[PDB]
Amino acid sequence: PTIAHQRTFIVVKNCHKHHISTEMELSMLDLEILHSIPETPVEYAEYVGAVKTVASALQFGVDALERGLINTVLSVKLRHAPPMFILQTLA
Amino acid sequence: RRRLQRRIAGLLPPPARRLNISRGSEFTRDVRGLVEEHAQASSLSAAAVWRAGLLAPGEVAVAWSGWRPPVFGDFLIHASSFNNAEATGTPLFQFKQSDPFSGVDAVFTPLSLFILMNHGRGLTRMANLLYDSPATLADLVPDFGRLVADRRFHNFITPVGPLVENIKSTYLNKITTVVHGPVVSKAIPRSTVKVTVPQEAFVDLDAWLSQPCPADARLYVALTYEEAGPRFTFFQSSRGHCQIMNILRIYYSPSIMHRYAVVQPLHIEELTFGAVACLGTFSATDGWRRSAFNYRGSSLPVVEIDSFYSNVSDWEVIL
Amino acid sequence: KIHPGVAMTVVRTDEILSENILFSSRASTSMFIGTPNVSRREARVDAVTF
Amino acid sequence: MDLKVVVSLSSRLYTDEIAKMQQRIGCILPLASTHGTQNVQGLGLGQVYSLETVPDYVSMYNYLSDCTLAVLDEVSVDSLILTKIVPGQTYAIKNKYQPFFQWHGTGSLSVMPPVFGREHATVKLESNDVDIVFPMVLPTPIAEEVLQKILLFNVYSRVVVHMHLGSVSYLGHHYELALPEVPGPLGLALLDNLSLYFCIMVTLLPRASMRLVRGLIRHEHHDLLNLFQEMVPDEIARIDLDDLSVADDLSRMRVMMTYLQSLASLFNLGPRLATAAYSQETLTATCWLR
C-alpha cells in the first residue's frame, strides 16, 4: 500500500528435495530358513526367530526413517535460523 | 501369438529390486517375497524338493538374483598330512605333484606349509604342535630345497580356496574346498564359515600405510623367498592388483636389498623375489575380525575374514 | 627476558560447546513426504544389504 | 539388484549448469562412497585434480583404481542420479567423450584422468562451490599409447621432437594432451620400478635374438628393421661375438616370460572395462567391468 503525504514485489520460493537412506543388513541364513516350511518343532522354533529377525530389521529400517525425517526437518530448521543477536536488531 | 504371450509371462518378471512399503510392522506378502531367498537343501521328499525349487534349471526357485553358486573342489589327500582339528574356513594350497598318475593330492594349510619353511633352519609352537612329524610333510614335496633354490616354488603351489567340509577319514582323507565362488558352508543346518588366517602371518596393508571407502577389500597371499627360508604372508588390501604389485614392491624394497646383501645372485634364476596372487574379495567394512584358534593346550591368535568370495588367480612375480 | 624492538598481539580462537534453543514459528514450512521404499543394494556371500 | 545413487546437491543449480551437466549423460564418474545417498563432495575426480597448475596423474590413478565408479544418467536441479558399476553386472556405456576416440568391436576401455586438460572435461558448480571433472574413457590401444607418451615425456624432460611426443596421433585426428613436469614422489617411483625392470631385462636378455637381428639387418630390409636405419648397434655386435648356447637360453626365456607379465601389469594401472557389441550408429557398447 501507500501513504498519501504502487509497488508489487513478486517473489519466487523453490522447494529443495532431501534424500535419506540407511542400510540394514540381513543374513542369507534367516531368509533361506524363512522361505522353507518347517516340519519339526525345533525348526518352527527357529523359523519364528527368523521371522522375528527380518521383521525387526524391516521395522528398524522404517524406524530409522521416521528418525531421519525428524533429523532432516531439524537440520533444515537449523539452516534457516539466523541467530538472536541479528534478529533482535533486524526485526 | 497367445502361446508366446504365456511363454513371456513366465520370462517377464525380474527380481523385485525396490518395493514401496507403508509400514515395516505390517510385514506384507510383497516385502516377504522380496526378502525370501530360495534354499540349496531340503528334506528328501517331493513336497520339500518342489518347494525348495532344487529341480529348477540354472538357479533355485519354487515352481539372475546376483547369487552365483560356488564350485567345490574335492581332494583325496593323505590323512597324516592334514590335521582334522583345524578350523573350517582355512585356505589350502595344493602342491602340483611331479608323478604323472598320483591319485592322492598334497594340500597345505598355512600352518602345514609353515613347517616346510622352518625345517632346514606363535605359529611355530602351533605349527609344531599340530604336526608332530614334519618328515611326513617334507616328502610330499619330492625336492623342496632344490625347488626353493632355483626359485620355482610359486608356480608349483596353486591355491585352492578355503576348506568347507572335511570328513574324518582314516587313511585317505577327502576334503571339500570352494575353489571359486561364494565361500559358504555345506551342512544340514547351514551356517557361516569365516576364513581363518594366522595373525603373525597376516599383515594388514591398509594400516601399514596408516577418504575413498571402496566396497571390496581383496585378500592376497605372498610366497616370497628370503634367506631364512620362504615366507607366506597374507595381505589384505582394498586396492586393485595393479596397485597391489606396486605397493608390494614398495613394501618389500628393504628385503630385496637384504637378499641382495646376504647372498649374491651368481645364477640367473635367483633374480626373482617371490610372487603374489589374489585369494578373493571380501567386504571392507566388517572384514578381518580377530579371533583365536584354540588347540589342546595352546592357542595362536587368528584373523577371521567373514563373507569371503574365493576367486584365486595365477601368481604375479614381485622381483 | 629483555624487550626486542617490537611487540606482538596474540590472537587465538576459543571453541565453546553451547546448548542452543531453536524457535520456529507455526506453519512456517510446507513439505511433501514420499514413500519409504526398501531396496537391494548388494548381495554378499552371506548377507544381502537392503 | 538396485544400483542407483542419488547425490543430493546441498545448494541449487543454475540453468546453464543444468545444461552443461545434462550434456554429460552416460559419462563414467568415480564415487567416494558406494552407498545409496551421497553429497557432492567426494564425487568425481576433482578432489585430487584440484585447480592447480601441475597435474599428478598417478595420484589420480591411486584415486581411480581405489574408489568405485558410476555412470551419470539423470541430472536435475538439486540432485543428480548415478548408477554404480559393480563387478558381476553388465552395463551399456555410451561413447560420450569430447575427444572422439572410436571404440573397437569387443575392445577394452581403460578409464583415465583427463589427459587433454582439466577444462576439456569439467563442470564448474559455482552454486555448490565444488568442481566436478570427468575421467576420460579411451580404448586401451590408445590408452597405453598416451600413458607411454606421458612416461617418455617424463624421461625425455632433462634431455630437452617435443611436439611429436607431446601429441597422440589417431586415425581420426591427432590430439594434444597436457603434460606435467613433476608428478611428485608417486610418479618417479613408477619410473623407478620401470628402471629396475629394464635393468633386470638388460641382465637376463638372451643372445640368439641378437644373433638373428644382426644378420637380419645385414641381410633383409624389413619394415621392422627400418628404425635402425640399417645400423647394427655396437652392444649387439660385442654381445654377438660370444658363442651361443641353448641351455642358458631356455633358462633366460623361462625368466623372461614371467617378468614381462609383471612389466605389463606396471602399465595396467587404472580400472579396466571390457566391451561387447559396439555399434557406431547407437554409440553405445554393452560393457562390463573387468
Coordinates of C-alpha atoms in Angstrom, one line a residue, chain B residues 29 51 68 82 86 101 123 125 127 132 152-153 164 175 178 192 197 242-243 253 274 278 295 299 311:
Chain B
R29 CA 3.3 -60.5 1.3
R51 CA 9.0 -76.1 -2.6
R68 CA 26.1 -67.4 -8.2
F82 CA 46.2 -82.8 7.3
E86 CA 41.8 -77.3 12.1
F101 CA 49.1 -90.5 -12.3
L123 CA 52.8 -70.1 14.7
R125 CA 54.5 -73.6 18.6
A127 CA 52.7 -75.5 13.7
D132 CA 54.4 -83.9 15.4
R152 CA 60.4 -72.3 -8.9
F153 CA 58.2 -72.9 -5.8
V164 CA 34.4 -76.1 4.0
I175 CA 38.3 -82.5 1.8
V178 CA 35.5 -73.7 -2.5
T192 CA 28.6 -69.2 8.1
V197 CA 44.4 -66.9 8.7
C242 CA 47.9 -53.1 -10.5
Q243 CA 48.1 -51.2 -7.2
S253 CA 62.1 -52.9 -1.1
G274 CA 58.7 -64.0 -4.6
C278 CA 44.7 -62.8 -5.2
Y295 CA 44.1 -76.3 20.2
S299 CA 46.1 -71.1 21.2
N311 CA 38.5 -66.3 -6.5

